[PDB]
């Protein structure tokens, strides 16, 4: 049966995620003309910019308040004030400036809402009166939740800041979740075929930036102030990822009565079907033949693989909880046996997830879902408790388990730095169902050749 | 009675090649035609007689340079399309040879080319001292004397032995003429030419077995657990020089009668070796087969020990599948022998209803066995073409077919799942364990949640309002099972690992005491 | 230096290609309402349908004339006559019916042009007067060339039969070459961006066919009779693949004065640049900024890999000659060292390829190009003459060299049956440049992990 249990150890060995501020920084890099300031020590931002570099091989703009010894003793609201001044004074185009707290500035208790109000009435009116500048508090203490909850918080804070319901319209708010450019592309394709306009939070396709002959391009997000304000006017909010867009979706529900459709994460055929059904329901638009065709093209790809190769494969999955769960679900439709799911933070709401209730009702073999997990929860099981696996699905930080215990691994989630180009491919939708199934197969195939495990069978499947 | 297809009304000769087994009908009432010429333009499933000789029977020999005398195409087209494995590091899969006949050889012949090729090949593969040369359409037609050139090289190189198979594609209507040709060439050219070392009181030839995914290794496992010397396997995992000592066997154990009855029949006439026909598939047909071989050698207790152990190990897994498969419809659509090997036992032991069988190249003897073994209502077809297969899918509406790869991909489009009857899915399918693997693959194909998904039209306003983002195979299969079955403490899903054969290769066998 | 040399052995050990008829059959399956009849033994068509099944996991419709012993002695035109009747009588929608010769029917000298004359004036007028039916002889003896030259022949035979110049237009003819659906999609993207209309020989995207809920779909080509007639009306013919499109392009140049632009195969950035420049020249259409951006996006991906990972990697390449040569050129732009190219048939014109002369002029490391090659030309060099390789690029029939000599291999070309979904991705264009370079990297990366060869370095590239 499928047993949900909390990690036993109190400590962390080999972490799956980083802290809430990293999630707020990720939200912020997805907004046009946005540069967050991370209020804390320099590493809290510089290390996170490296994370994003590791995934994308691009540099994104984020600043530090540069906390030092004095501010840690006496308070550091002045460090923020100077930061805002220095940032605005040197970056003329910036219009959005999140103020993102860290463990330090939360503990020492700096009044961020206070110092923002001061700058709005003060500095911004005096020195910068001709400029649009939105300062936004993001309270993201590192000693609760994770980058995942930080993301949820930040999306709420940006929508809370900007959303107004002046001119109701028929658009939806699509909160993609923390996904790849290839996911944004896929989701936009689905919306286009449904003929449904949306505010897409976030438009990060432009993270894949060119080298132009005139050296003029840069990676940036394209979610605009206008789009964020327009979130108040939508007829519904589709928050695909419950752990990354519940707060913003419910905020708009509670504040403007915009209905929130939370999940399921559209991973796999069946979950993509539910998305399209939910769009129809919300908007009244019919599901067109063209998507039934693309769906069937996807199913064809899956048919070639499922009972021949994927059936009964033993899978471990980790990463963002919505990804983990979505993948587990799709794997079961692919006849596979996900046997260990790691959910690598303290969220108390996993046990209440309907998708996890369904797994508990319906799974009929030995499965574990470990909450507050770390990578030692997987490695210890392999090394000392005889867990047998055919495949891992997760991000690159788990890689040494794959490498050193000879279990092949498909790179999914964030960050994926030990493979090239993965951000351009979908994991959601019908296109993503194709990509996941074919790449799991291709991963298994390479492994069968490595180990000489019936490698000769790959001829007339 | 005979059956006509809508799609073949315009070619009424086809009506003679299909029968539905009618109420109270016997084999004396109706039988399809078989082993006739093919109708051009029909899109018949059939291959050539080079296929039958070289691709099916010849190439499995594991210690042999398999050289096709002809243009490269015949060779490319038969390379890396088969799963006959060997314990000679799959030499027979990894290395293939073509003479690369060109235009200039059409006028003048290609005898020198042939010879240069043979020398080149033995040079590149110094560990290999055996060779079979297969004739193709082009070399038949230009008239090179392959036998002479082989003799010429065997004179010059007494360390090598070369076999000649003159079975070009156009030599007959199908695969089948190639079967006959290579059987008769082998016994004429090669049997009797090697005296074997005998290591046991009980010696067999295992005949008509090609070791698809390890089938032969499964069966030879059982034989060795009985202290039987397997002198030869014709030809799966077989040794060229082993097969030259077939004249010394005590018993010919024949599985694929279609492909290898010719050599068993001549081995009886030439050397008085008796022919015993067996089934390699299913618990009862295999138990019966092994019991008989045991009795024959007066070692029936050893056979019974294997049977009891194997059935105890695997029956609780076979029966798990049987419960979920009961009443599901299946078409047994291989090329040959498999249709009658499976016809009865698959219904008995897996719970399937056989609604059709076909043969691409089989003789009337194969339809005798097939009709004899299936139930009334069953549609039996000789030399099917694509439209007929498609029409049979619409008319019979089977839950699964067992067929070739590309035929399976035709069925895929019309929402009929397949297993590869020829190459298997997760083979091997012979043996007690193999029978369970077979069942599991069928179960996984029928109750695939992707298959369930594919039948849903998402444009439809009263569509299934999905709840969870998954359905397990068991959620699709177990809904109407009795509580006794659902809660059984004995019935379980298959417990074997991905590769059921590699364990066999690392196995020591208890020696027995010779008289 | 780069030396072109011919295989020493007269015989073939492990062939790279099959024979001419296979190529004619491939051309045939890309035309709407086409079913070719392969005139010869049953294996000449059934085995080839299996090759296509191996690549696409789809069934295509091709028939046999079913040569038996009678025909081999007396001649077999009668079998063709019966094949045409039986086909048309049972397939009412067929409109194009190639008659494809084999080794046998060439040798016995059956007069196929004559038998087509006879059916046109006879059966087709008497039995099928109300139907359009095009019978097209394709002479493809297997004892010359290969499936590559057979493809070349067939494209010419099909264009010769249909092309008329009764309504000149500004379209181009795009002869893709023997490519994947993903390449068709890519090339049509470029044309769309260039604002250029084309007759695309061939429209094989519909090879990737759905399972639909009513079971109504099938794999098929979409190059129509109308398209093939209109090849006569174009302002230019783009034959990307010299060894697969020269005959057809030159036929139209001589017959209808349509200028023929033969190659280069657009693999890599530079070859794609040349294609777009050649299209500008021949149509007068300018190269838009959109394609410059897309180009720079592809260059960015390459920039992340080239000097860190690809540089000086020793590569062997085989498959269709145009693919082999295009890949070698791109590899050199990626700072790699292709040290062995196999060209696996008897074509006498390789030594005159200008792309090959450029390689001879400009390479000064040790590099061999082997003509009339087979796979033993590769294996023997590794096994017995100390050839060191970092990477192989080639189709699935070479796989056992990769597997058994522990050299990693990117699957390119035809057929690629031991991996899933490869036909949906491009190898041409800027999208192809990305795909090739990132998949080469990912291949190298998995290999580094398998061998523990500085696998720890894949963190902060
Ligand atoms: S300057 Fe350096 S990296 Fe920063 S916190 Fe301080 S020691 Fe550490 Fe740590 S948990 Fe996260 S990353 Fe920060 S907000 Fe706190
Ligand atoms: S029926 Fe069979 S496969 Fe056909 S040729 Fe004849 S023996 Fe061979 Fe060979 S080289 Fe190619 S595939 Fe043919 S056209 Fe000739
Ligand atoms: Mg980049
Ligand atoms: Mg397909």
CA distance B444 to C171: 50
Q: Is the CB of B434 under 6 A from ligand 2?
A: no
Q: Which two tokens stand for residue B162?
A: 């070369």
Say if strands B229-235 and B203-209 run parallel, antiparallel, or are unpaired: parallel
CA distance B291 to B273: 19
DSSP secondary structure code for residue B297 in this structure = H
Cβ neighbourhood burial of C251 (10 Å; 0-12, 13-18, 19+): buried
Element (H, E) at A39: strand A37-39
DSSP secondary structure code for residue A456 in this structure = G
Element (H, E) at C238: strand C236-239
Contacts of A182 (CB under 8 A, 6+ apart): A423, A424, A425, A426, A427, A431, A432, A435
Element (H, E) at C433: helix C429-451
Quick check: C47 and B78 CB within 8 A? yes
CB proximity A215 to C under 8 Å: no
CA B136 to chain C, closest CA, distance in angstroms equals: 9
3-class DSSP state of C369: strand
Strand partners, A239: A175, A262
Cβ neighbourhood burial of B514 (10 Å; 0-12, 13-18, 19+): exposed
Give long-range contacts, CB 8 A cutoff, 24+ apart: B8-17. Answer: B8/B385, B8/B387, B8/B388, B8/C90, B10/C86, B10/C89, B10/C90, B11/B39, B11/B42, B11/C86, B11/C89, B11/C90, B13/B39, B14/B39, B14/B388, B17/B381, B17/B382, B17/B383
Opening angle at CA A350, ends A347 and A354, nearest 5: 155
CA distance B236 to B60: 5
DSSP secondary structure code for residue B513 in this structure = -
DSSP secondary structure code for residue B8 in this structure = G
Can you list the alpha helix ranges (DSSP code H) found in B125-256?
137-142, 146-156, 176-189, 215-224, 240-243
Contacts of C437 (CB under 8 A, 6+ apart): A420, C301, C302, C305, C306, C310, C334
Cis peptide before B235 (omega within 30 of 0): yes
Contacts of A329 (CB under 8 A, 6+ apart): A264, A267, A268, A270, A271, A355, A359, B468, B469, B470
Please tell me the residue having the least CA distance from ligand 1 atom 5: A44
Strand partners, B419: B402
CA distance A222 to B421: 54
Opening angle at CA C197, ends C193 and C201, nearest 5: 110
Please tell me the residue having the least CA distance from ligand 2 atom 9: B74
List of chain C residues whose C-beta atoms are within 8 Å of the C-beta of residue B44: 42, 64, 66
- Do C240 and C263 meet the contact criterion of CB atoms below 8 Å apart? yes
CB proximity C226 to A under 8 Å: no
Chain-centre distance for alpha carbon C205: 14
Chain-centre distance for alpha carbon B163: 23
Cis peptide before A264 (omega within 30 of 0): yes
CB atoms within 10 A of CB C322: 26
Q: Is the CB of A71 under 6 A from ligand 1?
A: no
* Chain C (334-373) residues lying within 8 Å, Cβ to Cβ, of chain B: 346
List of chain A residues whose C-beta atoms are within 8 Å of the C-beta of residue C403: 449, 452, 455
Q: What is the DSSP string of B101-126?
A: --THHHHH-SHHHHHHHHHHHHHH-T
- Do A221 and A31 meet the contact criterion of CB atoms below 8 Å apart? yes
Q: Which two tokens stand for residue A299?
A: 């199913």
CB proximity A417 to C under 8 Å: yes
Backbone φ and ψ for C260, nearest 5 degrees, come out as -105, 125
CB proximity C403 to A under 8 Å: yes
Please tell me the residue having the least CA distance from ligand 1 atom 9: A44
- Do B345 and B318 meet the contact criterion of CB atoms below 8 Å apart? no
Opening angle at CA A449, ends A447 and A455, nearest 5: 115
- Measured CA to CA in angstroms, residue C376 lies from A217, B85, B127, C5 at distances of 49, 21, 16, 15
Cis peptide before C430 (omega within 30 of 0): no
Q: Give the number of C-alpha atoms closer than 13 A to the C-alpha of residue B392, restricted to the C-beta side.
A: 32
CA of B24 to the centre of ligand 1 (A): 86
Chain-centre distance for alpha carbon C354: 20
Cis peptide before C202 (omega within 30 of 0): yes
3-class DSSP state of C5: strand
CA distance C235 to A343: 61
Can you list the alpha helix ranges (DSSP code H) found in A195-312?
225-230, 242-256, 268-283, 289-303
Chain-centre distance for alpha carbon A348: 19
Give long-range contacts, CB 8 A cutoff, 24+ apart: A398-403. Answer: A398/A16, A398/A318, A399/C449, A399/C458, A401/A375, A402/C449, A403/C449, A403/C452, A403/C455
- Do A459 and B424 meet the contact criterion of CB atoms below 8 Å apart? no
CA distance A110 to B172: 92
Q: What is the DSSP string of B433-490?
A: HHHHHHHHHHHHHHT-HHHHHHT--TT-TT-----SS---HHHHHSTT--HHHHH-SS
Q: Is the CB of C19 under 6 A from ligand 2?
A: yes
CA distance C316 to C368: 10
- What is the widest separation between alpha-carbon atoms in chain A? 75
Please tell me the residue having the least CA distance from ligand 2 atom 4: C44
Residue tagged 């087969």 (tokens)? B289
CA distance C433 to C302: 8
Q: Which two tokens stand for residue A296?
A: 């069937």
- What is the widest separation between alpha-carbon atoms in chain C? 75
CA distance C126 to C112: 20
Residue tagged 């009961």 (tokens)? B326
Contacts of C21 (CB under 8 A, 6+ apart): B73, C38, C40, C44, C48, C100, C101, C102, C140, C142, C147, C150
CA distance C236 to C259: 5
CB atoms within 10 A of CB B479: 8
CB atoms within 10 A of CB B497: 10
CA of B69 to the centre of ligand 2 (A): 11
Q: Which two tokens stand for residue B384?
A: 């099917």
CA distance C324 to C314: 15
Cis peptide before A202 (omega within 30 of 0): yes
Please tell me the residue having the least CA distance from ligand 2 atom 7: B169
CA distance C422 to C413: 9
Cβ neighbourhood burial of B484 (10 Å; 0-12, 13-18, 19+): exposed
* Ligand having the closest approach to the CA of A59: 3
CB proximity A190 to C under 8 Å: no
Chain-centre distance for alpha carbon B214: 11
CA distance A387 to A401: 13
Rg, Å, chain A Cα set: 23
CA distance A250 to A262: 9
Contacts of B470 (CB under 8 A, 6+ apart): A268, A270, A328, A329, A330, A332, A333, A358, A362, B449
Backbone φ and ψ for A68, nearest 5 degrees, come out as -125, -165
User: For chain A, how far is it from start to end, CA to CA, in angstroms?
Assistant: 32
Q: Which two tokens stand for residue B130?
A: 């055996």
- Do B396 and B381 meet the contact criterion of CB atoms below 8 Å apart? no
Q: Which two tokens stand for residue C323?
A: 């693919």
Domain ranges of chain C: 18-163, 164-265, 266-312+429-461, 313-413
Residue tagged 């001119």 (tokens)? A167
Cis peptide before A415 (omega within 30 of 0): yes
Quick check: B406 and C53 CB within 8 A? yes
- Measured CA to CA in angstroms, residue C450 lies from A318, A405, B394, C443, C446 at distances of 22, 11, 49, 11, 6
* Chain B (449-468) residues lying within 8 Å, Cβ to Cβ, of chain C: 454-457
- Measured CA to CA in angstroms, residue C330 lies from C265, C306, C333, C336 at distances of 11, 11, 5, 9
CA distance C27 to C12: 26
User: For chain B, how far is it from start to end, CA to CA, in angstroms?
Assistant: 56
Quick check: C210 and A300 CB within 8 A? yes
- Do B457 and C213 meet the contact criterion of CB atoms below 8 Å apart? yes
CA distance B18 to B380: 6
3-class DSSP state of A394: strand
Contacts of B45 (CB under 8 A, 6+ apart): B335, B360, B383, B384, B385, B386, B389, B404, B407, C46
- Do B438 and B224 meet the contact criterion of CB atoms below 8 Å apart? no
Q: Is the CB of B74 under 6 A from ligand 2?
A: yes
Q: What is the DSSP string of B234-279?
A: EETT--HHHHTTGGG-SEEEES-HHHHHHHHHHHHHHH---EEE--
Say if strands A337-343 and A2-6 run parallel, antiparallel, or are unpaired: unpaired
- Do C90 and C84 meet the contact criterion of CB atoms below 8 Å apart? no
CA distance C461 to C459: 6
**Residues A350-389 as b or e (16 or more Cβ within 10 Å = b):** beebebbebbeebbeeebbbbbbbbbbbbbebbeeeebeb
- Do A65 and A83 meet the contact criterion of CB atoms below 8 Å apart? yes
Contacts of C375 (CB under 8 A, 6+ apart): C13, C14, C15, C16, C318, C342, C397, C398, C401
Q: Which two tokens stand for residue A323?
A: 């990804």
Opening angle at CA C204, ends C201 and C210, nearest 5: 160
* Fold held by B49-190: Rossmann fold (3.40.50)
Chain-centre distance for alpha carbon B283: 18
CA distance A411 to A416: 6
CA distance B422 to C366: 46
Nearest chain C residue to B10 by CA distance is: C89
3-class DSSP state of C2: strand
Cβ neighbourhood burial of B492 (10 Å; 0-12, 13-18, 19+): exposed
User: For chain B, give me the number of helices (H) and strands (E)?
Assistant: 23, 14
CA of B227 to the centre of ligand 2 (A): 44
Q: Which two tokens stand for residue B414?
A: 């019309």
CA of C83 to the centre of ligand 2 (A): 18
CB proximity C104 to B under 8 Å: yes
CA distance C161 to C31: 13
Quick check: B426 and A308 CB within 8 A? yes
Residue tagged 């090739």 (tokens)? C436
Strand partners, B207: B234, B254
**Residues A101-130 as b or e (16 or more Cβ within 10 Å = b):** bbbbbbebebebeebbeebeeebbeeebee
Instruction: Give the per-residue SS3 of B364-433.
Output: HHHHHHHHHHCCCCCEEEECCEHHHHHHHHHHHCCCEEEECHHHHHHHHHCCCCEEECCCCCCCCCCHHH
Helices C181-194 and C289-303, interaxial angle, to 10°? 140
CB atoms within 10 A of CB C118: 15
Cβ neighbourhood burial of B499 (10 Å; 0-12, 13-18, 19+): middle
The residue among C17, C25, C34, C46 with the most chain B CBs within 10 A of its CB, best to mutate, is C46
- Of B50, B134, B141, B165, the one to substitute when testing ligand 2's pocket (max ligand atoms within 8 A of C-beta) is B50
Sign of CA dihedral B267, B268, B274, B280: positive
Element (H, E) at C149: helix C147-162
3-class DSSP state of B98: strand
Say if strands B251-254 and B203-209 run parallel, antiparallel, or are unpaired: parallel
Q: Which two tokens stand for residue C72?
A: 């081999």
Contacts of B400 (CB under 8 A, 6+ apart): B328, B329, B330, B331, B416, B417, B418, B419, B442, B445, B446
Backbone φ and ψ for A135, nearest 5 degrees, come out as -85, 130
Q: What is the DSSP string of A144-211?
A: SS-HHHHHHHHHHHHHHHH---SS--SPEEEE--S--HHHHHHHHHHHHHHT--EEEE---GGGS---
Q: Which two tokens stand for residue A15?
A: 């972490």
When CB atoms are compared, the residue of C212, C293, C417 closest to A292 is C212
Sign of CA dihedral B237, B242, B247, B250: negative
CA distance B509 to B230: 13
């Amino acid at each position: 049966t499928c047993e949900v249990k909390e990690k036993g150890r109190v400590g962390t060995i080999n972490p799956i995620f980083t802290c809430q501020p990293a999630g707020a920084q990720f939200v912020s890099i997805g907004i046009k003309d946005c540069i967050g300031i991370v209020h804390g020590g320099q590493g809290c931002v510089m290390f996170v910019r490296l994370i994003f570099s590791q995934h994308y091989k691009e540099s994104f703009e984020l600043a530090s308040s540069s906390l030092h010894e004095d501010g840690a003793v006496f308070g550091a609201c002045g460090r923020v004030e100077e930061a805002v001044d220095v940032l605005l004074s040197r970056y003329p185009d910036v219009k959005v400036v999140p103020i993102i707290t860290t463990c330090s500035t939360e503990i020492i208790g700096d009044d961020v809402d206070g110092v923002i109000k001061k700058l709005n009435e003060g500095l911004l009116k005096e020195k910068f009166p001709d400029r649009e500048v939105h300062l936004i508090a993001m309270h993201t203490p590192s000693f609760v939740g994770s980058m995942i909850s930080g993301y949820d918080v930040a999306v709420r804070d940006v929508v809370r800041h900007f959303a107004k319901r002046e001119a109701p319209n028929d658009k939806i708010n699509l909160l993609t979740g923390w996904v790849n450019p290839g996911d944004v592309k896929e989701l936009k394709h689905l919306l286009g075929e449904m003929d449904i306009e949306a505010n897409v939070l976030f438009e990060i396709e432009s993270f894949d930036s060119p080298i132009l002959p005139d050296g003029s391009a840069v990676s940036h997000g394209n979610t605009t102030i206008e789009d964020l304000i327009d979130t108040g006017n939508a007829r519904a909010t589709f928050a695909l990822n419950r752990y990354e867009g519940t707060k913003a979706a419910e905020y708009l529900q509670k504040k403007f009565e915009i209905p929130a459709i939370i999940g399921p994460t559209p991973i796999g055929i069946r979950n993509t079907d539910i998305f399209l059904q939910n769009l129809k329901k919300a908007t009244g638009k019919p599901i067109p033949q063209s998507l039934a065709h693309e769906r069937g093209v996807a199913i064809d790809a899956l048919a070639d693989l499922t009972h021949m190769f994927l059936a009964e494969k033993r899978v471990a999955i980790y990463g963002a909880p919505d990804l983990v769960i979505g993948l587990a679900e799709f794997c079961l439709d692919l006849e596979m046996k996900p046997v260990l799911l790691l959910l690598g933070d303290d969220n108390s709401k996993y046990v209440d997830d309907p998708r996890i209730k369904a797994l508990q009702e319906n799974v009929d073999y030995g499965m574990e879902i470990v909450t507050n997990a770390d990578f030692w929860e997987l490695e210890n099981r392999i090394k000392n408790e005889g867990l047998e696996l055919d495949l891992i699905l997760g991000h690159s930080k788990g890689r040494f388990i794959s490498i050193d215990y000879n279990i092949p691994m498909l790179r999914v989630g964030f960050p994926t730095y030990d493979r090239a180009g993965l951000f351009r491919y979908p994991t959601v939708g019908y296109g993503g169902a194709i990509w996941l199934a074919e790449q799991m197969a291709n991963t298994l195939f390479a492994d069968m050749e490595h180990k000489k495990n019936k490698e000769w069978v790959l001829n007339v499947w | 009675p005979h059956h006509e297809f809508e799609c073949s009304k315009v070619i009424p000769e086809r009506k003679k090649h299909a029968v539905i087994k009618g109420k109270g009908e016997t084999l004396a009432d109706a039988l399809p035609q078989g082993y006739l010429n093919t109708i051009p333009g029909s899109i018949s499933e059939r291959g050539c007689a080079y296929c039958g000789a070289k691709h099916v029977i010849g190439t499995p020999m594991k210690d042999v340079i398999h050289i096709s005398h002809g243009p490269v195409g015949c060779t490319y087209d038969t390379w890396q399309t088969k799963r006959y494995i060997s314990d000679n590091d799959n030499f027979q899969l990894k290395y293939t040879y073509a003479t690369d006949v060109k235009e200039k050889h059409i006028v003048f012949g290609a005898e020198k080319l042939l010879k240069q090729n043979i020398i080149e090949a033995f040079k590149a593969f110094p560990q290999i001292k055996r060779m079979t040369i297969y004739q193709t359409c082009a070399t038949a037609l230009i008239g090179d004397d392959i036998n002479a050139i082989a003799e010429e090289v065997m004179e010059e190189m007494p360390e090598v032995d070369i076999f000649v198979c003159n079975s070009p594609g156009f030599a007959g209507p199908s695969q089948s003429g190639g079967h006959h040709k290579i059987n008769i060439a082998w016994i004429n050219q090669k049997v009797g030419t090697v005296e074997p070392e005998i290591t046991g009181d009980h010696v067999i030839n295992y005949v008509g077995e090609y070791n698809i995914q390890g089938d032969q290794e499964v069966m030879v496992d059982y034989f060795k657990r009985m202290g039987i010397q397997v002198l030869s396997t014709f030809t799966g995992n077989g040794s060229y020089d082993g097969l030259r000592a077939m004249h010394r066997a005590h018993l010919n154990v024949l599985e694929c009668a279609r492909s290898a009855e010719y050599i068993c029949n001549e081995l009886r006439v030439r050397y008085g070796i008796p022919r015993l026909d067996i089934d390699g598939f299913g618990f009862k047909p295999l138990a019966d087969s092994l019991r008989k071989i045991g009795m024959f050698f007066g070692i029936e207790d050893r056979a019974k020990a294997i049977i009891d152990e194997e059935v105890a190990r695997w029956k609780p897994e076979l029966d798990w599948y049987k419960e979920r498969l009961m009443g599901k419809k299946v078409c047994l659509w291989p090329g040959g022998s498999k249709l009658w090997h499976w016809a009865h036992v698959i219904e008995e032991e897996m719970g399937l209803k056989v609604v059709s069988v076909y043969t691409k190249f089989g003789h009337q003897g194969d339809m005798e066995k097939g009709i004899a073994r299936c139930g009334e209502g069953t549609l039996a077809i000789d030399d099917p073409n694509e439209l007929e297969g498609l029409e049979a899918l619409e008319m019979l509406k089977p839950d699964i077919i067992l067929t070739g790869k590309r035929p399976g991909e035709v069925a895929k489009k019309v929402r009929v799942p397949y297993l590869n009857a020829h190459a298997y899915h997760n083979g091997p399918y012979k043996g007690f364990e193999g029978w369970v693997r077979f069942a599991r693959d069928i179960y996984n194909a029928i109750y695939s949640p992707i298959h369930q998904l594919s039948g849903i039209d998402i444009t439809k306003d009263n569509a299934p309002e999905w709840g969870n983002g998954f359905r397990t195979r068991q959620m699709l299969s177990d809904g109407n099972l009795s509580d006794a079955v659902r809660n059984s403490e004995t019935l379980r899903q298959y417990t074997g690992g991905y590769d059921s054969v590699s364990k066999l290769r690392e196995r020591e066998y208890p020696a027995f005491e010779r008289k």
